[PDB]
């Protein structure tokens, strides 16, 4: 948001962030994630600044929108909590999903079966999706990641400060990114709320 009044975050969105526990971090703090937090509260939990979260989410949406081919963006989630939200993000915007185990050599080995050459990479967890994110340093790939307070920022170019551990938070954070991507492209109106609710992105314990 370039200080624009149409791109500012609204109360219906802050209420969604509060209900999902996105503003709440862990007990540890990475030294390169320090500028994204507000304060540490007693019981030793760091609070993430939702204004900063919104700015980083909009920057990531801009970076995604700049890619001409929708399928050139690849979205990856290793943990099951993000596996329903990356197959649902890819079905709305057209990106390429990888849910489950990432095969080493996907981006570097040019004779394998599932060989691909993305132009942009979006991952759910820098610590869990470390192999796809370091393999991207061999083939000139930009990286967008959902980062907690203890997340390292190596090979991470756009880090979104959020609670990337809770299922509701992960689903909401993936649902907001798709919403902003569609509303930036111009396929969804910016006045009417999205008829798709965040529940479609959430993870359910069987």
């Amino acid at each position: 948001s370039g200080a624009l009044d149409v791109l500012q975050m609204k109360e219906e969105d802050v209420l969604k962030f509060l209900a999902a526990g996105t503003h709440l971090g862990g007990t540890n703090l990475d030294f390169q994630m320090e500028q994204y937090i507000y304060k540490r509260k007693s019981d030793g939990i760091y609070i993430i600044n939702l204004k900063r979260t919104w700015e980083k989410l909009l920057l990531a949406a801009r970076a995604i929108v700049a890619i001409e081919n929708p399928a050139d963006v690849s979205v990856i989630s290793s943990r099951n909590t993000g596996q329903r939200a990356v197959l649902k993000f890819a079905a709305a915007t057209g990106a390429t999903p990888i849910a489950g185990r990432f095969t080493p050599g996907t981006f570097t080995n040019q004779i394998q079966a599932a060989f691909r050459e993305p132009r942009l990479l979006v991952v759910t967890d820098p610590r869990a999706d470390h192999q796809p994110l370091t393999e991207a340093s061999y083939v000139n790939l930009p990286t967008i990641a959902l980062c907690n307070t203890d997340s390292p920022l190596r090979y991470v170019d756009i880090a979104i400060p959020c609670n990337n551990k809770g299922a509701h938070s992960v689903g909401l954070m993936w649902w907001m990114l798709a919403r902003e991507v569609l509303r930036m492209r111009g396929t969804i109106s910016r006045e009417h709320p999205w008829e798709v609710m965040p529940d479609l992105y959430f993870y359910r314990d069987p």
Partner: protein, 132 residues
């Protein structure tokens, strides 16, 4: 020991992922659908594939397996995935908020929120594990 081999297991997985509609739970029918389609040598190799097929179809009823992919199962799992309750989990009448989060929302010009309820924080600053 009676352990199958990669040849029979691969052939059976391919048969199941390609012909899910005709295969079933009965061994003696799956034994006759394999001979109609797959060009297999003698009966002993034909049966060991059609037996593991029957064994491996029961597991599908229990749920999906990490070795095959049926598009009908894809459709069923998409019907499962397209599930949303009438009342979402994120619309709540009251949201409990710490006194420290309330000040952050104040800095975010969100001091007029009416669903909030500031709660009492924990007093004892004991959030570490004992060492040793």
């Amino acid at each position: 020991g009676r352990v199958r081999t990669k040849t029979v297991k691969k052939a059976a997985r391919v048969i199941i992922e390609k012909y899910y509609t005709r295969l079933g739970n009965d061994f003696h029918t799956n034994k006759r659908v394999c001979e109609e389609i797959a060009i297999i040598p003698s009966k002993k190799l034909r049966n060991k594939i059609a037996g593991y097929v029957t064994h491996l179809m029961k597991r599908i009823q229990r749920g999906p397996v990490r070795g095959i992919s049926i598009k009908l199962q894809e459709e069923e799992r998409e019907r499962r995935d397209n599930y949303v309750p009438e009342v979402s989990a994120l619309d709540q009448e009251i949201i409990e908020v710490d006194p420290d989060t309330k000040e952050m929302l104040k800095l975010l010009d969100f001091g007029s929120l009416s669903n909030l309820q500031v709660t009492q924080p924990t007093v004892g600053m004991n959030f570490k594990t004992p060492r040793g």
